[PDB]
Amino acid sequence: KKADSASTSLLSPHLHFGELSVRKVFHLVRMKQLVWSNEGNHAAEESCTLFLRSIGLREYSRYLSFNHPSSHERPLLAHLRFFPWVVDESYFKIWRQGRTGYPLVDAGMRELWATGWLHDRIRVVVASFFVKVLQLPARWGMKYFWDTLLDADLESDALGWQYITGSLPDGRELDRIDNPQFEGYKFDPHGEYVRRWIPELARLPTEWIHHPWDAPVSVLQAAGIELGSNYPLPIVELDAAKGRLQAALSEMWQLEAAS
Amino acid sequence: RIVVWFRRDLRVEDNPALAAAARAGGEVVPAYVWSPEEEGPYYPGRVSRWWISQSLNHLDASLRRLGAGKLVTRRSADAAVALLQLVRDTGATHVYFNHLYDPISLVRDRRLKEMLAAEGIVVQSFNSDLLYEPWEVVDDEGQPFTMFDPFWNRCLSMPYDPPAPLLPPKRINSGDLSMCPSEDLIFEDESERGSNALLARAWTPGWQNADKALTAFLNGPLADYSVNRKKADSASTSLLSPHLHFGELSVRKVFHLVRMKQLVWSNEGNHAAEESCTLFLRSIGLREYSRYLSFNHPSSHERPLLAHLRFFPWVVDESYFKIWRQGRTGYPLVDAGMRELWATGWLHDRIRVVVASFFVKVLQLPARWGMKYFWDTLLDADLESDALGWQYITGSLPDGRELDRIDNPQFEGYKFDPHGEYVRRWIPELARLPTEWIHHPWDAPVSVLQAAGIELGSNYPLPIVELDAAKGRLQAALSEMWQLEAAS
Amino acid sequence: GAVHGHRLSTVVPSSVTGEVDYALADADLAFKLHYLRGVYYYRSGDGLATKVLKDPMFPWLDDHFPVAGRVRRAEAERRPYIKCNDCGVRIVEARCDRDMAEWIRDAAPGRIRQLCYDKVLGPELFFSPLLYVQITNFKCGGLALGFSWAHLIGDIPSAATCFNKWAQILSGKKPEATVLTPPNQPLPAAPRSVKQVGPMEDLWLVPAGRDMACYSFHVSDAVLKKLHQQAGTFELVSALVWQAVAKIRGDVDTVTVVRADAAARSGKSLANEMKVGYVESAGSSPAKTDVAELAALLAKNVVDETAAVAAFQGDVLVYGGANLTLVDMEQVDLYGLEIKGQRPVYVEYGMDGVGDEGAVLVQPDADGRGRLVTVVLPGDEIDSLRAALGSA
Ligand SMILES: Cc1cc2nc3c(=O)[nH]c(=O)nc-3n(C[C@H](O)[C@H](O)[C@H](O)COP(=O)(O)OP(=O)(O)OC[C@H]3O[C@@H](n4cnc5c(N)ncnc54)[C@H](O)[C@@H]3O)c2cc1C
Ligand SMILES: Cc1cc2nc3c(=O)[nH]c(=O)nc-3n(C[C@H](O)[C@H](O)[C@H](O)COP(=O)(O)OP(=O)(O)OC[C@H]3O[C@@H](n4cnc5c(N)ncnc54)[C@H](O)[C@@H]3O)c2cc1C
Numbered sequence A: 001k002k003a004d005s006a007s008t009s010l011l012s013p014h015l016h017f018g019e020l021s022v023r024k025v026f027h028l029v030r031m032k033q034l035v036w037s038n039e040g041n042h043a044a045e046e047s048c049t050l051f052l053r054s055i056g057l058r059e060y061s062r063y064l065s066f067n068h069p070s071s072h073e074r075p076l077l078a079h080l081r082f083f084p085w086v087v088d089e090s091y092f093k094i095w096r097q098g099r100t101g102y103p104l105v106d107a108g109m110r111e112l113w114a115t116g117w118l119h120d121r122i123r124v125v126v127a128s129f130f131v132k133v134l135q136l137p138a139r140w141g142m143k144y145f146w147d148t149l150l151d152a153d154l155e156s157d158a159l160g161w162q163y164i165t166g167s168l169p170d171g172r173e174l175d176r177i178d179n180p181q182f183e184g185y186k187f188d189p190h191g192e193y194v195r196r197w198i199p200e201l202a203r204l205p206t207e208w209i210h211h212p213w214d215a216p217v218s219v220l221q222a223a224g225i226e227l228g229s230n231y232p233l234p235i236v237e238l239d240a241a242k243g244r245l246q247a248a249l250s251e252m253w254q255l256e257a258a259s
Numbered sequence B: 001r002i003v004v005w006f007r008r009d010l011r012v013e014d015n016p017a018l019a020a021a022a023r024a025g026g027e028v029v030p031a032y033v034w035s036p037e038e039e040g041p042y043y044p045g046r047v048s049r050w051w052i053s054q055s056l057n058h059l060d061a062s063l064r065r066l067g068a069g070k071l072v073t074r075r076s077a078d079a080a081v082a083l084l085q086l087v088r089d090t091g092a093t094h095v096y097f098n099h100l101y102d103p104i105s106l107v108r109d110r111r112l113k114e115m116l117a118a119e120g121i122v123v124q125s126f127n128s129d130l131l132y133e134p135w136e137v138v139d140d141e142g143q144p145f146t147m148f149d150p151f152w153n154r155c156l157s158m159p160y161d162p163p164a165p166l167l168p169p170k171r172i173n174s175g176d177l178s179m180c181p182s183e184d185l186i187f188e189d190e191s192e193r194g195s196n197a198l199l200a201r202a203w204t205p206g207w208q209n210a211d212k213a214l215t216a217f218l219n220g221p222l223a224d225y226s227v228n229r230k231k232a233d234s235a236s237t238s239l240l241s242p243h244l245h246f247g248e249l250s251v252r253k254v255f256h257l258v259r260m261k262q263l264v265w266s267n268e269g270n271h272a273a274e275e276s277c278t279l280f281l282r283s284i285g286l287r288e289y290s291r292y293l294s295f296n297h298p299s300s301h302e303r304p305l306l307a308h309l310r311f312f313p314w315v316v317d318e319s320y321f322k323i324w325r326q327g328r329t330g331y332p333l334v335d336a337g338m339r340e341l342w343a344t345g346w347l348h349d350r351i352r353v354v355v356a357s358f359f360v361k362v363l364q365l366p367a368r369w370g371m372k373y374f375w376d377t378l379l380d381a382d383l384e385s386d387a388l389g390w391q392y393i394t395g396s397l398p399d400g401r402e403l404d405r406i407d408n409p410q411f412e413g414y415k416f417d418p419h420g421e422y423v424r425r426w427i428p429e430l431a432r433l434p435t436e437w438i439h440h441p442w443d444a445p446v447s448v449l450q451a452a453g454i455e456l457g458s459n460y461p462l463p464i465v466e467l468d469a470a471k472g473r474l475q476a477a478l479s480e481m482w483q484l485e486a487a488s
Numbered sequence C: 001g002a003v004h005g006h007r008l009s010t011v012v013p014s015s016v017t018g019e020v021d022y023a024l025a026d027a028d029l030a031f032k033l034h035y036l037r038g039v040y041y042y043r044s045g046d047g048l049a050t051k052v053l054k055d056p057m058f059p060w061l062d063d064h065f066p067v068a069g070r071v072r073r074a075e076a077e078r079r080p081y082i083k084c085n086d087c088g089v090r091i092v093e094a095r096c097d098r099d100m101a102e103w104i105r106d107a108a109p110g111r112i113r114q115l116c117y118d119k120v121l122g123p124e125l126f127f128s129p130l131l132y133v134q135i136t137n138f139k140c141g142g143l144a145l146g147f148s149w150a151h152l153i154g155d156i157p158s159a160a161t162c163f164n165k166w167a168q169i170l171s172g173k174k175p176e177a178t179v180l181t182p183p184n185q186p187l188p189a190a191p192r193s194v195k196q197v198g199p200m201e202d203l204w205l206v207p208a209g210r211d212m213a214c215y216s217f218h219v220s221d222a223v224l225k226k227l228h229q230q231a232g233t234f235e236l237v238s239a240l241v242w243q244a245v246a247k248i249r250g251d252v253d254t255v256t257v258v259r260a261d262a263a264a265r266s267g268k269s270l271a272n273e274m275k276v277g278y279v280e281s282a283g284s285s286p287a288k289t290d291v292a293e294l295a296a297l298l299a300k301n302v303v304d305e306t307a308a309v310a311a312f313q314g315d316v317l318v319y320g321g322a323n324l325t326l327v328d329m330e331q332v333d334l335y336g337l338e339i340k341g342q343r344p345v346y347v348e349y350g351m352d353g354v355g356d357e358g359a360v361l362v363q364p365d366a367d368g369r370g371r372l373v374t375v376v377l378p379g380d381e382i383d384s385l386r387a388a389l390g391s392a
Helices: A012-016 A022-038 A042-067 A089-096 A103-115 A120-132 A138-148 A154-165 A180-187 A192-197 A217-222 A239-256 B016-022 B036-042 B046-065 B079-089 B103-118 B148-155 B190-201 B207-218 B241-245 B251-267 B271-296 B318-325 B332-344 B349-361 B367-377 B383-394 B409-416 B421-426 B446-451 B467-486 C026-030 C050-054 C057-063 C100-104 C156-171 C221-228 C233-249 C291-300 C306-311 C379-391
Strands: B002-006 B028-034 B072-075 B094-098 B122-126 C004-011 C035-042 C070-073 C080-083 C089-096 C131-138 C143-150 C216-219 C254-259 C278-280 C324-328 C346-352 C359-364 C371-378
Touching: A022 A042, A042 A154, A089 A103, A089 A120, A089 A138, A103 A120, A103 A180, A103 A192, A120 A138, A120 A154, A120 A180, A138 A154, A180 C004, A217 B190, B002 B016, B002 B079, B016 B028, B016 B094, B016 B122, B028 B079, B036 B103, B046 B190, B046 B207, B046 B367, B072 B079, B079 B103, B103 B122, B148 B271, B207 B241, B207 B251, B251 B271, B271 B383, B318 B332, B318 B349, B318 B367, B332 B349, B332 B409, B332 B421, B349 B367, B349 B383, B349 B409, B367 B383, C004 C057, C026 C306, C035 C156, C050 C089, C057 C089, C057 C156, C143 C156, C221 C233, C233 C254, C233 C291, C233 C324, C233 C359, C233 C371, C233 C379, C346 C359, C346 C371, C371 C379
Parallel strands: B002 B028, B002 B094, B028 B072, B094 B122, C089 C131, C254 C324, C324 C359
Antiparallel strands: C004 C089, C035 C143, C035 C346, C070 C080, C131 C143, C216 C371, C254 C278, C359 C371
């Protein structure tokens, strides 16, 4: 789950272009499991279990597209057909440039433009934020991912969005917005991920690094930060966004039971 | 019996004061007094204070492991007052310290000699900071040198070598200092402690870490120093400057260790590494020349630091100074360095040249302003070395850099950051901007800046001052200065 | 050799709650100046590193989001409420090169106060956490969890049953749901079981003046039945100390007593329905009383003042405010704090913010065989009561 280090395989774009046989990955990992088990390395043994599960998610990516493809009666994200999307090209551009004032969101949005790749958990942070905070058309941030991901994969992109929007029973809870400090603590305990991609925030102590707008002015200035000039103010506030979330979801469930 | 007064020699190896107190026979009381009010404008700045707080703790344990009760920490506004309370309180015969060379210490410390010699204390001062004493190196008429090349050429041809580094004491005897109290020193505002502690991401102050950084550089990037010393996109230099400012490392050990590496490399045919040592010692000699300048030609009133820029009409503009500190100038090489200076307390020497040259050539703000900011943000903020650097970049020295001239940012970029990887590390916004325009984005076509995802003015700032406006205003400011200068 | 190196962190609810006000009852506001200090001790610190203890707190505080809020005051036409902003609860990491076994069998003055964080609704009223958790490692490989919990948030059954839903979380079992969705709405003379004290501004702790101190004692099942051979257990070892304190100070004929009765409990997990009521020794001197009758006195001579304390408009202090007050909690799941398999070796609850009257909390032990009782006393007073109790 950590993004403050190279914790995952970074085989993502290779596997999309068939540059590496998943069957070879499977056989080699399974045999690594056997040696570690025999070496008393239980944690490492446990690790391959989860890594193969991540391989299986790519299998499930093709399963869902072969069995349950989507065109017209239930196209992808059909359940929010009736969602009141904020059509605001200004907010989209601010999300694109990583100028949203939410560090973990801005950090990952820089790396995405920089290296054409993002850690999975950061793939949800900037995506959950795009549809549950700024609440823009999910079809919009989909086309940005398509243009700026090297491992841009039709089925796996489909699965990943369906996951964060809650479009299928495995997915994530809809009327709910992740507190940034929850994200930060799971994906970035020492804030070193955004310090590396947002060197402006380097002096901000770890306690506030994922939510600078709640910091006392005395702390912001001690870190040489001045919200609005040095590092942006939160373009949309969380309270004003979960509020907007209820007003947009029941308006739609009202539209739902009306047809 | 003997007090050892620490100031900017927070080490235990090759420390002639402490090593002679221990070899006198009697006890040794090692102490440090924090008298910053005596430093006037050169009162230690924010992040330099954070270093001393760790360096002293670190030197405390070192001293205690060698048989000491403690390092006595005294507080005062006058060093003599606190020092002679201690000679009384702790009752000593002698006071030993290693003498500094800045204009403040030079006369404060001769007021201490007499002040202490009037209450019967014998005082002795030793050399802890220079290969050669400033009076030891002169020209053929016995005069000080005025340029760096003849001076360093002399040290390299001195009739004797720099004294070999002394060993540390076998152990030191302090007696019972359970009596003697130490004042809890305050180096950090409560408000700043949480951001000051993030400086440890990049640095670890201390005699012990200075020693590990030296053997890291000696066995690593020293061999390529001849060809890479100017680049800021790799760790090309020793990163020893804060350690050397606080005297946590001997320069006489560095000299001797480097001269041994050279002899071996010369016997291995490694000609490029052999010149690397020649050039790195020269950098050690620039630190020697900083002391040689502040001792032989001090700041006076008859002629101050930047005296050649007396009638220079500076731009006074607090807005510009704010943009410069925040690295939002719109010049990527400058912004990249201003971001790293704030985040780590350190800058490669050539990025110092870039950010300071930009300060007095493009924004043309009072050099004092930037000299003060440097003092609050640099971990190695060093009186004589900072003076020499600003004197060099403004052209007060005959050695120094031309006055009536602005660097093309591509000239700076190709010398210190040829692949743009320094800019891209510290300004990730411009990661996808090609090397060809990464140091002057304002010149790129819109298509190229749109491909790089850059909107000059929203994604990354516009040039706060354009080069051609800066050069026009520089000639108008110098002509204004030169018509004024003749009017006197 | 005290506990050292505190470094503090915050945890928040996993979901952001939003604009949301938690109205608190006037029974909640009645205890706004009292604070519970529960500490649980564990043989093993093994496998309970700080991230394993911290990680479950995020889902836990989505079920208990008002404890991660902070206090505000609405205007009148000033009653306080809980701002549903996720300030979170502060976690304090500390160690002690002590062996924990050594320290629990020490009868130490003020260890309750060393292993729980020292802070209350205080000068910074609007940014003061409602809950702190301090994780103290020992060189024994022991680990004590001291919880500093405001009584405004909840009673002690509420405090103790929410902390173990946390331990249910940690170990991988599913807690039974939180109940706070019937909102709290508002509603004479100073009730005698409580005590009036002057307008309390923004620091909700009454200074005691004469320095109060914690201490506690094991009363075993053997003395549990000489108790019998002389009204259930808690009001005879309540009676034991009530008079014991009475030969210490004398004017001890009034005493109020706090009840954690589950029969009056609403079912809602963030409440304040402990029941409050006077006791008076009219017949003869508690210091002159035989214990078996003041025990008999505290069972049927009980007086229900609970409804009236909440209806009090004004700041009051009930534990140790007016009379000495004994504590009814012996039936609170304190050894249900199961860290996956490990349930504690030792649990003791303290308090602060209780007036100079003192208070005694009567609560269970490891075996469910005897009781543990913590006594808040004017510190000069535990010198003698330990002698006073030593006979018993
Ligand atoms: C909104 C969103 C969009 C995504 N878009 C893509 C995409 O275009 N292409 C893509 O390959 N993955 C996509 N993913 C899945 C996941 O984010 C990446 O596969 C993973 O982060 C790439 O890093 P890695 O190769 O080091 O992963 P590892 O941890 O090394 O996983 C091993 C391999 O398993 C596969 N995999 C792992 N997790 C997933 C997953 N959740 N879904 C599908 N396959 C997975 C990948 O091929 C990956 O290389 C998306 C996820 C989300 C939430
Ligand atoms: C405007 C300006 C301000 C400066 N301010 C300082 C300052 O506050 N403190 C400071 O120590 N240096 C200062 N310098 C000098 C130089 O920038 C630093 O010495 C160097 O950047 C430190 O990095 P380093 O230790 O890796 O140097 P290296 O290249 O590894 O050199 C080894 C050592 O030689 C010494 N040295 C190298 N160059 C110089 C120099 N030009 N003048 C004096 N000593 C030198 C330092 O002690 C340094 O640690 C300044 C230069 C300029 C142009």
